[PDB]
Design a protein around this ligand. Structure first.
Ligand SMILES: O=c1ccn([C@H]2C[C@H](O)[C@@H](COP(=O)(O)NP(=O)(O)OP(=O)(O)O)O2)c(=O)[nH]1
Ligand SMILES: O=c1ccn([C@H]2C[C@H](O)[C@@H](COP(=O)(O)NP(=O)(O)OP(=O)(O)O)O2)c(=O)[nH]1
Ligand SMILES: O=c1ccn([C@H]2C[C@H](O)[C@@H](COP(=O)(O)NP(=O)(O)OP(=O)(O)O)O2)c(=O)[nH]1
Ligand SMILES: [Mg+2]
Ligand SMILES: [Mg+2]
Ligand SMILES: [Mg+2]
Lengths: 163, 163, 163
C-alpha cells in the first residue's frame, strides 16, 4: 500500500478536513473512477421543484492551478430526478470553507428524501488554465487565422428537427 | 490522413464499440471542437418536466487517468429547453457499459421529440487527477498559508442585487 | 506586474474582444479562482421556469487543444435558483462568435431580474483531449483487461435508499 507505484508517482494529494468526523472520507467507488463521492451531513426532504444548500461535512484545499468540480450522481438523477443547481459546482483553489451541494428536485411529483450519510454528489479535481486575458480589437488584428467554425454556435451544425 | 502530424503526436486514442451499428461514429462538428456528438439510439417524447434515460448505441474505454464528460448541446438547450439531469455526466475509466444520456425537458409547455439518429449530447475526454486524500485536523496544521478567498463562497464576491 | 513569475511561465493567454466595451473585462474574484466572471450585456427578467439566451459582450479565442467552459455561479444558484440550461456550456477552440449564456429560472415562484453589468456566470479554460476514435468489435478484441467497475453505472454502487 504505502509504496507509490511508478505510474502513480505524480498523483496529486488533496488536504481534507472532516468538519463532520461522523462521515466516512469521500472515496472512489471503483479504481479509476473520476470522482470521490461526497456525503450529506444532513437529513433533507425536497418537494418537487425545491432546492437546498446541503452540508457535506468536508473542507478541502484544491491545489493552486487546479479546480474541484462537484457533479451529480447518475443513479439519483435518473431514478428520482435529483440534480445540482450550479452543476458543475466550481471549488476554487483558495476556498477553505465547507463544500456545500445545491441539491434540487427536478421530478414533477415525488419528493426526494436525503439522509445523513447518503452519497449525494461526486468531487473531481482537475488542472485549470489560469488564463491571462489579452484584449484585442479583433481576432484578425491578433494575427489569428480564420476558423472553420467561425461564429457558428447554438445548433449551427444541425442534428435535430428544431435546429 | 494516416500520418499523425507532429502537433498531434500525443493525441489520445479512445476505443469505441458501436453497440448499435446503424448510427454513425460520434464526430466533432468542426476541427478543434471539444467534444464528439452522441446520437440517440431511440425515439423518445418528453413532456414538460419529464426525463428519460436514453441509449446512445456506444460504449467507450476512457483511459485510466482520464474521464469522459457528457455535456448538453447549446442549440437544443436554448431552442427547446433540452437539458441533462446529471450534467456533466461523468464516465469513469473503468466503465464498459453503454453510455446513456439522462435527457430532461425544462420547457414549461412544449414537448420535445427526439428521433433515433438525432445528436443529443456531446462527449469530451479530459485528464483527471486521481487524488490521494490527506486527512488533516486543520489547514493551519498542514502548513497551508491563509488564502485571500478564505471561507468565502456562495455569492461572497457580489455582482447581483440578491447577493 | 509585467514580469511573469517562474511558477506562471507556462500560463496560457486568451485573446478576448469586448464586443460591448461598456462592460469590464472578465476577472477572477480572488487569486487562484478557477474561472473569470462573465457579465450580462442585457437586462432580462425570467419568470419561474423561463429561460433566455443572454449576451455577455465578449468573444474569445480558446486555444486549439483547449475548451472554454461556462459554469453557473453558486450564490445565484442557491439564493434565487438561477441556472444554465446547457451547463457546463462548451466553448469550442474554433468559435469566434459572442459567448452567450442560456440562463434559466429554476425557482417555482419568484422571478429573477438580471441587470446589465451583473456577473451571471464564470468561464474556465481547460485542456481537452482531441480524441481519435478507434472502433473495435469488443473491448476484449482490443486487448483491454476486464475492469472492476465493468458495466456498472447509474447508481450501481448504492448510497441512497432509491438505488
Ligand atoms: O454556453 C455556450 C455554449 C456554446 N456557445 C457557442 C460556442 C460553441 O463553440 C458553440 C457550439 O456549442 P455546442 O456544440 O455546445 N452547441 P451545438 O452543438 O448545439 O451547436 P453547433 O451545432 O454549432 O456545434 O456555441 C456559447 O456561446 N455558449
Ligand atoms: O458547489 C459548490 C460551488 C462552490 N462552492 C464554494 C467554493 C467556491 O470556491 C465558492 C465560490 O463558488 P462560485 O464562484 O462558483 N460562486 P459565486 O461566484 O456565487 O461565489 P463568490 O462570489 O464567492 O465567488 O463557493 C461550494 O461550496 N459548492
Ligand atoms: O451521463 C452518464 C453518467 C454516467 N454513466 C455511467 C458511466 C459511469 O462510469 C457510471 C457511474 O456514473 P456516476 O458515478 O456519475 N453515477 P452513480 O454514482 O449513481 O453510479 P455508480 O454507483 O455506478 O458509481 O454510469 C452514463 O452512462 N452516463
Ligand atoms: Mg458513482
Ligand atoms: Mg456542437
Ligand atoms: Mg465566484
Amino acid at each position: 500500500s504505502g509504496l507509490v507505484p511508478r505510474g502513480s508517482h505524480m498523483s496529486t494529494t488533496l488536504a481534507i478536513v472532516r468538519l463532520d468526523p461522523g462521515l466516512p472520507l469521500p472515496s472512489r467507488a471503483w479504481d479509476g473512477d473520476a470522482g470521490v463521492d461526497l456525503y450529506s451531513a444532513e437529513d433533507v426532504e425536497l418537494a418537487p421543484g425545491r432546492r437546498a444548500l446541503v452540508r457535506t461535512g468536508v473542507a478541502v484545499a484544491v491545489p493552486f492551478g487546479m479546480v474541484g468540480l462537484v457533479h451529480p450522481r447518475s443513479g439519483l438523477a435518473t431514478r428520482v430526478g435529483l440534480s445540482i443547481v450550479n452543476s458543475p459546482g466550481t471549488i476554487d483553489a483558495g476556498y477553505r470553507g465547507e463544500i456545500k451541494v445545491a441539491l434540487i428536485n427536478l421530478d414533477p411529483a415525488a419528493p426526494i428524501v436525503v439522509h445523513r450519510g447518503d452519497r449525494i454528489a461526486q468531487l473531481l479535481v482537475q488542472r485549470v488554465e489560469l488564463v491571462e486575458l489579452v484584449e484585442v480589437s479583433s481576432f484578425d488584428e491578433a494575427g489569428l487565422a480564420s476558423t472553420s467554425r467561425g461564429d457558428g454556435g447554438h445548433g449551427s451544425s444541425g442534428g435535430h428537427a428544431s435546429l
